[PDB]
Amino acid sequence: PDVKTTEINVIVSGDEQGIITKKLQDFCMNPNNENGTNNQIWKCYYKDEKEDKCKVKEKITSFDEFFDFWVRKLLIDTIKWETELTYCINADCNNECNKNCVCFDKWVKQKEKEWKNIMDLFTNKHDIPKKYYLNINDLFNSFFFQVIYKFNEGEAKWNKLKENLKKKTEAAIKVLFDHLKETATICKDNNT
Amino acid sequence: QRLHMLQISYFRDPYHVWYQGNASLGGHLTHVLEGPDTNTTIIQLQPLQEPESWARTQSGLQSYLLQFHGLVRLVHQERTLAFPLTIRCFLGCELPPEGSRAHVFFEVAVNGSSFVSFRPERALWQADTSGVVTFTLQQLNAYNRTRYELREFLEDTCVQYVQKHIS
Ligand SMILES: CCCCCCCCCCCCCCCCCCCC(=O)O[C@H](COC(=O)CCCCCCCCCCCCCC)COP(=O)(O)OCCN
Ligand SMILES: *[C@@H]1O[C@H](CO)[C@@H](O[C@@H]2O[C@H](CO)[C@@H](O[C@H]3O[C@H](CO)[C@@H](O)[C@H](O)[C@@H]3O)[C@H](O)[C@H]2NC(C)=O)[C@H](O)[C@H]1NC(C)=O
Ligand SMILES: *[C@@H]1O[C@H](CO)[C@@H](O[C@@H]2O[C@H](CO)[C@@H](O)[C@H](O)[C@H]2NC(C)=O)[C@H](O)[C@H]1NC(C)=O
Ligand SMILES: *[C@@H]1O[C@H](CO)[C@@H](O)[C@H](O)[C@H]1NC(C)=O
Ligand SMILES: *[C@@H]1O[C@H](CO)[C@@H](O)[C@H](O)[C@H]1NC(C)=O
């Protein structure tokens, strides 16, 4: 109770070039799993920002290292999903576009579970370090180069995401989750 | 006359940085910057800019710090950097007496050795001396932010500041 402990099962797309739906293919057919090509079991320990740990093959990282990876990959996958679902943005015959949409909604829910598990490491909302609870401007400045790198016309997609979070509603990740949840709502309704 | 800006960034590891910097209007120390990545304090030693204008400038400088750190983290993630390391940014604008165009610069050093620098003519970054260098240049030369917006900060924002606060 000095040191808070949590288990975070991270659904990793892959640090590869390609359609989000093919790497998360193994995750789309198989949702909740201890196995699967996309499973990544993390165990985190948090005391201070001076002393914190995370562990997974058996790699042990700092919380900052894990969290940078997690936020960076959350933002990359969101953009990859959005570009893929753009064509999925009303009536069909058990559509691929509908299957993509079903996996995205499942994926958003998985990411919310990952985020809430990460939040368990913090006793109260009033005192969660600024470092891990950044606003829209801060988060989009901090991850500009890291996210943008993965994409052709990356600077434009990043600006589009920032304006859409700015339209929505506070911490950028909650606003992002509201935006993802909404994308899945629109997507499912316009597909079924 | 001139506005020079200096920023030293001490990286213990990829995720923690201590900033230490300053700015001067021709010899005279005008600004100081210091603190960890999350809580960097930026001050104008004299009230040169009024509250509203200073708050806007501070916001730009804080956005810059977050972006800068991000770029270092990216180079490490992609190419591997050897920690601890220090990065120095030395930049500014100089207005010649009977000289139409202001002279501008932005030079980056790593662990005390020249690394990359900005060329305002075509708004491109070049090596000042290689996986790390090549990757860093690719990134800096890829975006409007690091090319054109940067040139406008140096040639437009910086120059106007000198004309307003010295004159
Ligand atoms: C009014 C005058 C203003 C001055 C205020 C006075 C205070 C002086 C204090 C001195 C201390 C600060 C020293 C840092 C200087 C950087 C200045 C930031 C530049 C800047 O404002 O440009 C922004 C973009 O920055 C970018 O271009 C972001 C890209 C960052 C990349 C920089 C390259 C370095 C990376 C090298 C590392 C390599 C590592 C690899 C191993 C956009 O400005 P805005 O929002 O104001 O414009 C609104 C107009 N529409
Ligand atoms: C910038 O200068 C740094 C000066 O400290 C330098 O770090 C030093 O060099 C290496 C990293 O490449 C470290 O590794 C050595 O020590 C460890 C034990 O700590 C040994 O296991 C290794 O075999 C090796 O001999 C040094 O420890 C480190 N010095 C200190 C005081 O920590 C960076 O490499 C430089 N970075 C760049 C990018 O130029
Ligand atoms: C990105 O860059 C180009 C410039 O290469 C932008 O076009 C204009 O060009 C000048 C430089 O010659 C810029 O300084 C201006 O900001 C741009 N003009 C206008 C009217 O905006 C282009 O618009 C940029 N694109 C995006 C999406 O940022
Ligand atoms: C600006 O900072 C550097 C180190 O942070 C220092 O060596 C230099 O003397 C400073 N400038 C002034 C005018 O004190
Ligand atoms: C920010 O850092 C400075 C030293 O760099 C320190 O004096 C100040 O108290 C810090 N701010 C907060 C909110 O603690």
Numbering used by the authors:
A (entry chain A): 497 to 552, 562 to 594, 599 to 678, 691 to 713
B (entry chain B): 9 to 137, 141 to 178
What does the published report state?
The PfEMP1 family of surface proteins is central for Plasmodium falciparum virulence and must retain the ability to bind to host receptors while also diversifying to aid immune evasion. The interaction between CIDRα1 domains of PfEMP1 and endothelial protein C receptor (EPCR) is associated with severe childhood malaria. We combine crystal structures of CIDRα1:EPCR complexes with analysis of 885 CIDRα1 sequences, showing that the EPCR-binding surfaces of CIDRα1 domains are conserved in shape and bonding potential, despite dramatic sequence diversity. Additionally, these domains mimic features of the natural EPCR ligand and can block this ligand interaction.
